């Protein structure tokens, strides 16, 4: 649960991402894959990537970063009223992709990391607080659907 002022911070931060969605999406995925190599094994289309240089050179990885962040941005713009947008993603991630909730924690922290790396000194403590709370809400509502489905 976020206040109006917190949502305002979230959507202000998101403007930084929307200025270069593919570059942010690429770096988020590279941070996830290099920090948590078990996550790469869930992607049949990226498991061939052995080095970070290959990851950086991959245009399909940048494409997928655009897909991921476009979906997250659409959810964030709903300011918590995201049941319809979140349900298909929860279902696909539990039943088809088999993504444990832990990996959603990993990517949440990776987003925070990338924001500081690309905007050092321009991602303030209030903005970090609000973004963290928004990603927690997203993760918690997915977790509720995972529990319904019995997925661990
Ligand atoms: C911010 C969180 C994320 C968002 C919004 C997101 C969004 C999406 C979207 C929109 C798709 C394509 C449609 C679909 O299959 O439902 C997708 C595919 C996928 N997601 Fe996620 N995702 C997230 C986190 C993750 C994480 C943490 C993993 C794995 C560690 C992951 C693994 C996958 C896989 C395996 C695919 C299928 C890729 C394919 O083969 O082309 N997702 N995701």
UniProtKB/Swiss-Prot annotation:
Annotated heme b binding sites: 93
A Pfam family it matches: Globin
Positions of the Globin domain: 1-147
A biological process from GO: oxygen transport
Coiled coil: none
Sites where the protein binds O2: 64
Reaction catalysis annotation: Fe(III)-heme b-[protein] + nitric oxide + H2O = Fe(II)-heme b-[protein] + nitrite + 2 H(+); H2O2 + AH2 = A + 2 H2O
Residues bearing PTM Phosphoserine: 3
Entry keyword annotation includes Cytoplasm: yes
Example of a GO cellular component annotation carried by this entry: sarcoplasm
Binding positions for nitrite per the UniProt entry: 64
Entry keyword annotation includes Metal-binding: yes
Subcellular location: Cytoplasm, Sarcoplasm
Function text: Monomeric heme protein which primary function is to store oxygen and facilitate its diffusion within muscle tissues. Reversibly binds oxygen through a pentacoordinated heme iron and enables its timely and efficient release as needed during periods of heightened demand. Depending on the oxidative conditions of tissues and cells, and in addition to its ability to bind oxygen, it also has a nitrite reductase activity whereby it regulates the production of bioactive nitric oxide.
Subunit note: Monomeric.
Family: Belongs to the globin family.
Protein name in the entry: Myoglobin
């Amino acid at each position: 649960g976020l206040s109006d002022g917190e949502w305002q911070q979230v959507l202000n931060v998101w403007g930084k991402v929307e200025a270069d969605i593919a570059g942010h999406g690429q770096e988020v995925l590279i941070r996830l894959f290099t920090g948590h190599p078990e996550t790469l094994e869930k992607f049949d289309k990226f498991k061939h990537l052995k080095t970070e240089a290959e990851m950086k050179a991959s245009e399909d990885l940048k494409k997928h970063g655009t897909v991921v962040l476009t979906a997250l941005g659409g959810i964030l713009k709903k300011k918590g009223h995201h049941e319809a947008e979140l349900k298909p993603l929860a279902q696909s991630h539990a039943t088809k992709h088999k993504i444990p909730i832990k990996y959603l924690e990993f990517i949440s922290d990776a987003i925070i990391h990338v924001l500081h790396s690309k905007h050092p000194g321009d991602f303030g403590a209030d903005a970090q607080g609000a973004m963290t709370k928004a990603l927690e809400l997203f993760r918690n509502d997915i977790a509720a659907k995972y529990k319904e489905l019995g997925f661990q």
